[PDB]
Amino acid sequence: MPEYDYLFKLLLIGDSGVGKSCLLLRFADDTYTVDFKIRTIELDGKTIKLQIWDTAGQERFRTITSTYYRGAHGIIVVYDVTDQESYANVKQWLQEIDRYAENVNKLLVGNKSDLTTKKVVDNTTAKEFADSLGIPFLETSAKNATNVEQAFMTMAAEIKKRM
Amino acid sequence: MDKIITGKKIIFSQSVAKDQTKNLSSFLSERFYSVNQSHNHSIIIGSSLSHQENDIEHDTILDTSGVLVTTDTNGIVNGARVAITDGLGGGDQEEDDEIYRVSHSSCENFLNSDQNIDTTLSLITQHTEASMAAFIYQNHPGKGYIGEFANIGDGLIIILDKRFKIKHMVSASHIYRGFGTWTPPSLQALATTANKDALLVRQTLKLAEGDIIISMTDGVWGELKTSLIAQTNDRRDIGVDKEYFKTLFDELTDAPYPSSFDIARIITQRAMSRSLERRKTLIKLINEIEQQHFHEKSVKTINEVLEYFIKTGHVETAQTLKAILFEDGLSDGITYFENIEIPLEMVMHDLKSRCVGDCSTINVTRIPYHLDELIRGFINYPEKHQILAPLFKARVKSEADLEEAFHRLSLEMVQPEIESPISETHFERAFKKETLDKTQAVLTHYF
Ligand SMILES: Nc1nc2c(ncn2[C@@H]2O[C@H](COP(=O)(O)OP(=O)(O)O)[C@@H](O)[C@H]2O)c(=O)[nH]1
Ligand SMILES: *CC(=O)NCCC[N+](C)(C)CCOP(*)(=O)O
Ligand SMILES: [Ca+2]
Ligand SMILES: [Ca+2]
Ligand SMILES: [Ca+2]
Ligand SMILES: [Ca+2]
């Protein structure tokens, strides 16, 4: 007797402080004020279990050897719309995916969209950059819960479409 | 000829808390099996896996090993196909069953092909995964034995001569996948990857009579002393420390003709002895750390932990922790960096979560002697004596070479049950002495 139809492993990557844990906490526990959470969703009749990891820069502390050669099904690259430096590093985060990781699904998220008086990363430029790479783009707010659900749901749908 | 593939083994794996008062003989008997095709090919398969505090009711061994012995048109043994697989993941019986299915089927498809190793790999590859170390060897007229070797993942193949001097090593590989993560290549990844030669290690070697070929999954060789061979930006090549590996065979130097089982047993004993010491050290270190109540002493980093132990005279405990964290003392593939500040809670969450051990498998193969195998066929197929007897005029250099061949045959041992728990392996002579003596008198007369 199965408890789910699909198990998808999602990875959150990006500079420290952009809100990756808060996006995780908002999507799984609907809380806001912690680098792994689980949530099962339904999508086209299928029940999809999501295991979501915030890498949390643990690469800076240790190197590990996993038993699987397979990686995550999808990677969400997060930046902070109030921090141009966090956006500038996105190209480096994406190169670490392309250089090493088998046609993984990607999504680009600009978090903290509620801080509209501090928003300095132009979403038009971020959208066009993501479109040039075939990567969907969303602006989110973990604080306001805006587009948080839609981001993880859209990633899950894109993975289901490529299977 | 004979085709043997190990079966799925399921054992009750006691926790480290209950194995802590266990000697090595008891540990081996509870966890290991032997499969013996003949004097010259043997498999030891088992599990050293264990949780620190909980018993594993159904611990499925996710490795597989197999062999197909090939012959020439006269039925004389002249080669073999050997494969060992390591199912990735697991350790849920439903999930374990699916991983074992791919591990077992990958081994059997390699054995069942009648192709060279490159064509065979193309046929058996074209979302569960298994790594594989495998080889094929065959006698070629005018050329002798040639062996084709392939390794995909972190299994290991070592080739030795009849005096146990190392000749070659087919090293284990890890591929860097970014974010501080290394992964062993899998056979199924070899089918869904753009770059093939990065995941596959290939070697072709001349082999001599009496050479010893040892294949191991990481559950065995990873417990021995290991050595980093090379590390590029994308690739890590690993093997056993060759100076340490030779000291294992010091136990066999006076044996005229040790069975493959004897060779495999010596290596398994040493690997599991070290594994048993490691798991006892680990749970001892965790208890000594928790006894200090560092949370109530404002000790929040590993460096503060090490300094606390050095200042209180328990420098040995400090050095043990450093070895585990910074030198990967447990052979888990986890290495912390030395020039950073590491939170204690991150390490404690790591240490208390770690299992110890793994599925552990080794196969040992001896490259047969040409004359011995001609005699074996002459004894086993008396109906073909008219075809086989003329071949002795080209395989016998002297009556002394004949005598040496009959001496090796008299030492051969077989396990009629083929498979058994390791503490229940029963061996008997492959041949009766009256059979060999009658055969040797006939050939000496015909000479
Ligand atoms: N205004 C606002 N602040 C946020 C949002 N998401 C995260 N933060 C802030 O970011 C800090 C924590 O970010 P965190 O989730 O730990 O980032 P991480 O290091 O990438 O995991 C908190 O102090 C929050 O106030 C958001 O959507 N809106
Ligand atoms: C405690 C635990 O189960 N950790 C997961 C590691 C998986 N083990 C149990 C080590 C089996 C191996 O994975 P791969 O190296 O074949
Ligand atoms: Ca975080
Ligand atoms: Ca491994
Ligand atoms: Ca395995
Ligand atoms: Ca293994």
Residue numbers in the entry:
A (entry chain B): 2 to 34, 43 to 110, 112 to 173
B (entry chain A): 20 to 110, 113 to 147, 163 to 483
Wording from the paper:
Legionella pneumophila, the causative agent of Legionnaires disease, secretes the enzyme AnkX that uses cytidine diphosphate-choline to post-translationally modify the human small G-Protein Rab1 with a phosphocholine moiety at Ser76. Later in the infection, the Legionella enzyme Lem3 acts as a dephosphocholinase, hydrolytically removing the phosphocholine. Through crystal structures of Lem3 in the apo form and in complex with Rab1b, we reveal Lem3’s catalytic mechanism, showing that it acts on Rab1 by locally unfolding it. Since Lem3 shares high structural similarity with metal-dependent protein phosphatases, our Lem3:Rab1b complex structure also sheds light on how these phosphatases recognise protein substrates.
Therefore, we used a site-specific covalently linking strategy to capture the Lem3:Rab1b complex. Size exclusion chromatography and SDS-PAGE gel shift analysis demonstrated that the purified complex Lem3C134S_C209S_T391C_C395S_C456S:Rab1bS76T(PC-C3) (referred to as complexT391C) was present as a pure monomeric species. Furthermore, as demonstrated for Lem3 wildtype, the mutants cannot demodify Rab1bS76T(PC), permitting us to obtain a stable complex. Crystals of complexT391C diffracted to 2.15 Å and hence permitted its structure determination. No specific interactions are visible for the C3 linker region while L68Lem3 shows hydrophobic interaction with the choline group. The phosphate moiety of the linker in complexT391C does not participate in direct interactions with amino acids, but is involved in the coordination of three metal ions located in the active centre of Lem3 at the same site as observed in the Lem321-486 structure and coordinated by the same residues (D105Lem3, D254Lem3, and D394Lem3, D105Lem3 and G106Lem3). In addition, a third metal ion (M3) can be placed in the electron density, which is coordinated by D254Lem3 and D190Lem3. Rab1b:GDP binds to the hollow region of Lem321-486. As a consequence, the sequence R71-T74Rab1b of switch II is reorganized into a β-strand (β’β3-4,Rab1b) and placed between the β-hairpin (located on top of the fist) and the thumb. F215Lem3 occupies the position of Y78Rab1b, which is located in the hydrophobic pocket in the Rab1b-apo-structure. As a consequence, Y78Rab1b is displaced by 9.9 Å (distance between Cα-atoms), likely contributing to the movement of switch II towards Lem3’s active centre.
